[PDB]
Amino acid sequence: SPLRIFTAGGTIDKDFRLEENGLVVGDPFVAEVLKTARLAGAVSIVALSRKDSLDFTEADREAIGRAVGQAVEDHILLTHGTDTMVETARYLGGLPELAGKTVVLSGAMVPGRVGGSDAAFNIGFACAAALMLAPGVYIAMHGKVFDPAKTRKNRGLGRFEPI
Amino acid sequence: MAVSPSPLRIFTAGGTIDKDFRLEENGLVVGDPFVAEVLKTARLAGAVSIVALSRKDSLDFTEADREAIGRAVGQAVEDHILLTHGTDTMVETARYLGGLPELAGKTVVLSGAMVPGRVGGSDAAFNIGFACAAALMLAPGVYIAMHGKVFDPAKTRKNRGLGRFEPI
Amino acid sequence: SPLRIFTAGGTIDKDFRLEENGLVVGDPFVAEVLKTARLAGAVSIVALSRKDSLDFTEADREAIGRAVGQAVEDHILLTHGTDTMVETARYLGGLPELAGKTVVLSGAMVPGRVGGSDAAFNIGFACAAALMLAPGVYIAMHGKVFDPAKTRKNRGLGRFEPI
Amino acid sequence: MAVSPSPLRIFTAGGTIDKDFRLEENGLVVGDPFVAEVLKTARLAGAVSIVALSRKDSLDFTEADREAIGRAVGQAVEDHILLTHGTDTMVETARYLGGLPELAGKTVVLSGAMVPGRVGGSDAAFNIGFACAAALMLAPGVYIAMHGKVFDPAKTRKNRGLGRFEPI
Ligand SMILES: N[C@@H](CC(=O)O)C(=O)O
Ligand SMILES: N[C@@H](CC(=O)O)C(=O)O
Ligand SMILES: N[C@@H](CC(=O)O)C(=O)O
Ligand SMILES: [Cl-]
Ligand SMILES: [Cl-]
Secondary structure, three states: OOEEEEEEEOHHHEEEEHHHOEEEEOOOHHHHHHHOOOOOOOEEEEEEEEEOHHHOOHHHHHHHHHHHHOOOOOEEEEEOOOOOHHHHHHHHHOOHHHOOOEEEEEOOOOOOOEOOOOHHHHHHHHHHHHHHOOOEEEEEEOOEEEOHHHEEEEOOOOEEEEO | OOOOOOOEEEEEEEOHHHEEEEOOOOEEEEOOOHHHHHHHOOOOOOOOEEEEEEEEOHHHOOHHHHHHHHHHHHHOOOOEEEEEOOOOOHHHHHHHHHOOHHHOOOEEEEEOOOOOOOEOOOOHHHHHHHHHHHHHHOOOEEEEEEOOEEEOHHHEEEEOOOOEEEEO | OOEEEEEEEOHHHEEEEOOOOEEEEOOOHHHHHHHOOOOOOOEEEEEEEEEOHHHOOHHHHHHHHHHHHHOOOOEEEEEOOOOOHHHHHHHHHOOHHHOOOEEEEEOOOOOOOEOOOOHHHHHHHHHHHHHHOOOEEEEEEOOEEEOHHHEEEEOOOOEEEEO | OOOOOOOEEEEEOOOHHHEEEEHHHOEEEEOOOHHHHHHHOOOOOOOOEEEEOOOOOOOOOOHHHHHHHHHHHHHOOOOEEEEEOOOOOHHHHHHHHOOOHHHOOOEEEEEOOOOOOOEOOOOHHHHHHHHHHHHHHOOOEEEEEEOOEEEOHHHEEEEOOOOEEEEO
16 A cells, blocks of 8 residues: 655754754655665655654644645655654544554664664554554554553653653 | 563675675675664664574575475564565565465565665665564565565565566 | 874764764764774774864863874874864864874864765865875865865865965 | 965775675675775865775785886876775785885885774774874885784785785
8 A cells, every 4th residue: 555754853963064063954864764674655745844753842742733734645654753653643543533543653773874863663553553543543663563652751761652 | 660571583695785795705704784773773672683694695505495484484483574675585485474374463564675785885784773663564474565565575686687566 | 004093083083972963073984984994014003082162262172283293103094074174174284293193183064973074085085185294284175185274164165275 | 365285195005994885795895984084184284186096905016016006106296195905915915015215205105904894893994094194104105004004015915814914
């Protein structure tokens, strides 16, 4: 079935810029991973945001909700910052218009363009989850599936964990 | 205090995925399993055992090479199994496993890479994430997870020229 | 002839830390490049500093000067931040105690651990410059040797340039 | 207004450095020149003209292969030249160039890699930086730059066993 991929930024997409002496949220890393994945099937990627998810407002979440509602596809991957991924996932879970869709949020604790990143693994795992899970809203990270209502991000731990 | 299960076990049978350069051969050999390098940086909640069954290019695979694999998979208590393997006889190995009543309650997923993990622009890390998900989320049975999709072994072939699995 | 490598930090050594949500100056990247360089010769690496060179003082340069004078080697590579590389190199150029040594400063505009880095090339180029140039102090960057007295860092181009 | 000179020219004659994985052949072939990928991100002050002469493994090399290299190097305007090359016949190529009086004013350096640039853990990027510096800074003559040092081709051999150049 067709997968639609939305990019909302996050650590996954960070890249070095000379002018900043540091990382900015750059081009979506998911496009770089899928470029060498030798895909059989139909995938389309759409840019929504280049924020760190720590800076997301109620209206940023509502804009993400609108974009997912404009998609005819029922298999959705949203790449995103880990810091408010739970907030975005809870918000999407509450929109009846998305009830028929399998929506999976994912990202990376380390930028894809930095050595030793989880990003490529997480993208493969999340693409499969978006294809294979029943309708609902999920966080796919650490090689497992989280329910957003019963999940938090534990910064001290460096992992999502159940409440 | 919740204890993370380890519901997935990985077996390695070699293939392009695991190829590495050696000075000795002046070429690629089947090296250490690349899946182990991907899981080291995957920040897994669980722990995943990685059992080495074989180290060949799948072209050189016999009925008893396939039968060794069958019994190792059979004796695993885990019901979620990923087997990394060469692409040239993956379909043959998958068909053989699909006939073992012993595996009837297991989700068994075969995967690899068309480009070695240790070579630039490889599909390996994506395919490992996809296939781990497949082994966890598909109903019991035997599957090939390649190219971002699930193949039925019985209704699949390998196109050697194009380096892709295709339906029949 | 034996090469001594001092690491003072800089963009070349930056690495991602979950805790900081960004880059820190990490372990020296020159050690990672030389690990796979299959060297025939005698090389030793010594850690001096992990600063961004923007934060170096006259006192820090004086310390760097004395540390380079501790080496009995006559061929020296100092990996260093690019922002005050010229100030450090001009300072060392005026130290009579270093007049018999070939001292080469280098670094990278992009961290070694980020994709698309100049670091490995710069380290190879700078190792050769330290071994092959006549006694003096030099900056090796952009595939050329700069005279520190006649050089500046021009953020306009993102490069060092002659004055 | 200041013009940056381009005093170094690079010629590529293939070798392990340039090997890349090809689905079709189920292995490594000599691919595009890896030196071009390193120089792309080196943020050079100048430009380096990179010219592909040959795509062999250095073993498939007859006097006529060497002779085309000798002419291309002889006709270059630049007096600083780097030739990337397989390590198995690097000494033979270097000794042949050392015999051409038209090269008398030129600093000519041969280099390559024991591991393909496109394989994990390669010496290539370091070897390219080191050899570029060597081509610019050594007096006229012909040299091999490998293992972070400079070799006299007359006094050097490739130890295929230990994967290194060494003195005789
Ligand atoms: N600060 C990042 C953290 C991450 O993505 O892992 C974000 O939420 O955008
Ligand atoms: N010849 C390889 C092909 C691959 O794995 O992609 C094999 O079957 O092991
Ligand atoms: N801010 C960095 C810049 C660099 O090294 O490129 C430093 O000078 O330490
Ligand atoms: Cl940063
Ligand atoms: Cl090969």
